[PDB]
Amino acid sequence: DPETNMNVSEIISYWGFPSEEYLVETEDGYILCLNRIPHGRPKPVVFLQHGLLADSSNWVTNLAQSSLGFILADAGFDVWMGNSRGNTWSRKHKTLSVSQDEFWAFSYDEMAKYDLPASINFILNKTGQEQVYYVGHSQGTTIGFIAFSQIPELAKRIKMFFALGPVASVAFCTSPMAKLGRLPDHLIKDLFGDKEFLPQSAFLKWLGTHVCTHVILKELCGNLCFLLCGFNERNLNMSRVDVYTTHSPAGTSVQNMLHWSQAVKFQKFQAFDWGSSAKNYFHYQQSYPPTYNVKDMLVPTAVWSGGHDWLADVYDVNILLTQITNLVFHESIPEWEHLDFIWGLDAPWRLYNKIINLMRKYQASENNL
Ligand SMILES: *[C@@H]1O[C@H](CO)[C@@H](O[C@@H]2O[C@H](CO)[C@@H](O)[C@H](O)[C@H]2NC(C)=O)[C@H](O)[C@H]1NC(C)=O
Ligand SMILES: *[C@@H]1O[C@H](CO)[C@@H](O)[C@H](O)[C@H]1NC(C)=O
């Protein structure tokens, strides 16, 4: 497969689409790579945000008529895809080197606080548009829930929020992440260091111990993304595995994994606990981390969840839906697993078509004013 050892711009150009990349600088000096599909093979803007240990690839890794990024371009949208700090394409800084611990001293807190405002405000300036549609998967969902409840000036800029496999609280997840999560913070630091989260073969074998055993592929259990997220074999293109395997995982910090462990352990949707009153005060101007309330998020939201989703589990998803003021739509696809939202064979007709039609319903209402 030519897409395996290709960059995200090369994949877009391979499928016959216009490709554009942009370097954006955050308020805290990180240099993010934005991917753009300006037209199909001024238009309304859609911003696609990847999840845990992923990248822009996620929206352009199936075929031209089965990948969200590509179908949105063909449906008449100006497609923008974000890359979270620390991944393959966003591992540059104005001052810091990738060899310094301070470079990796971030979690999804900084992604929501600095990556999203910088990325969205760059787009709105470039296009001249006043608003964007926001689509998030997995961790991209939580970045949205934080950014849009914490930054009301940014929320105003969002027409509609499409949450695919939504994650706020991760209190009841049964994914191998709750296993890594329930280890003490000092042990995670001891095993993986203070920089990039790079687990070796022995750790992934331990994380995989009798949880990834009623699977045909099994090579998928060696992959960090497939392991933490979970895959539905009834709905994956098992011939495309090497494309998914090469592009994912795409990189994150040990601190981001520490934050996800704190989310499992404390069962609270909050900012990162730095370990002491003094350390927290140095970051938040208070001794305990600020809590994030989904009730403060007034953006019109459309939610898709999977009944067999390990990470964005049924129990946590049901709690979340009761907290979304202005829930426009919600659907639970009973057999879907976490990765089905981005790589499901049936995702174009059970998901991608509904997203396009809700955007058009919003457009019809807009054009009516
Ligand atoms: C499922 O995966 C296979 C393998 O990635 C896809 O087949 C490739 O499709 C492209 C575009 O049509 C061709 O250029 C390749 O030569 C095909 N073969 C291989 C082995 O890469 C297939 O189209 C995917 N999609 C579905 C829905 O089956
Ligand atoms: C992607 O590959 C193309 C072609 O080699 C190159 O021009 C571009 O700068 C690359 N982008 C990144 C982010 O590596």
Author numbering: 9 to 49, 57 to 384
Excerpt from the publication:
Lysosomal acid lipase (LAL) is a serine hydrolase enzyme located in the lysosome, where it breaks down cholesteryl esters (CEs) and TGs into free cholesterol and fatty acids (1–3). LAL belongs to a gene family of mammalian acid lipases that includes gastric and lingual lipases. Unlike the well-known mammalian lipases of the lipase superfamily, triacylglycerol lipases, LAL shows a dual catalytic activity, capable of hydrolyzing both TG and CE. LAL deficiency in humans results in multisystem autosomal recessive disease phenotypes, WD and CESD.
In the present study, we have expressed and purified a triple glycosylation mutant (TGM) (N51Q, N80Q, and N300Q; mature protein numbering) of HLAL and determined the crystal structure at 2.6 Å resolution in its lid-closed conformation. The recombinant HLAL-TGM was crystallized in the orthorhombic space group P21212 with two molecules in the asymmetric unit and diffracted to around 2.6 Å. The overall architecture consists of a core domain and a cap domain. The core domain, which constitutes residues 9–183 and 310–384 (mature protein numbering), contains a central β-sheet composed of eight strands (seven parallel) and six helices, three on each side of the β-sheet. The cap domain fold (residues 184–309) is a complex mixture of eight helices, turns, and random coils, including a lid (residues 215–244) that adapts a “closed” conformation. The structure also includes GlcNAC sugar residues on three of the N-glycosylation sites (Asn-15, Asn-140, and Asn-252); the other three potential sites (Asn-51, Asn-80, and Asn-300) were mutated to Gln. Among these, Cys-227 and Cys-236 (mature protein numbering) form a disulfide bridge (Cys-227–Cys-236), whereas the other Cys residues are free, as previously discussed in the case of HGL. As suggested before, Pro-241 and Gly-245 residues flank the lid acting as hinges, with the trans-cis-proline isomerization inducing opening and closing of the lid. It is apparent from the structure that the catalytic Ser-153 is completely inaccessible and substantial conformational changes must take place before substrate can bind in the postulated active site. Cys-240 and Cys-244 are in the lid region and are deeply buried pointing toward the catalytic Ser-153 (Cys-244 is only 5 Å away from catalytic Ser-153). In our HLAL structure, His-274 in the α13 helix is involved in a hydrogen bond interaction with Ser-122 and Gln-285, is sandwiched by two aromatic residues (Tyr-123 and Phe-287), and stabilizes the interaction between the α13 helix and a long loop-helix-loop region (residues 286–304).
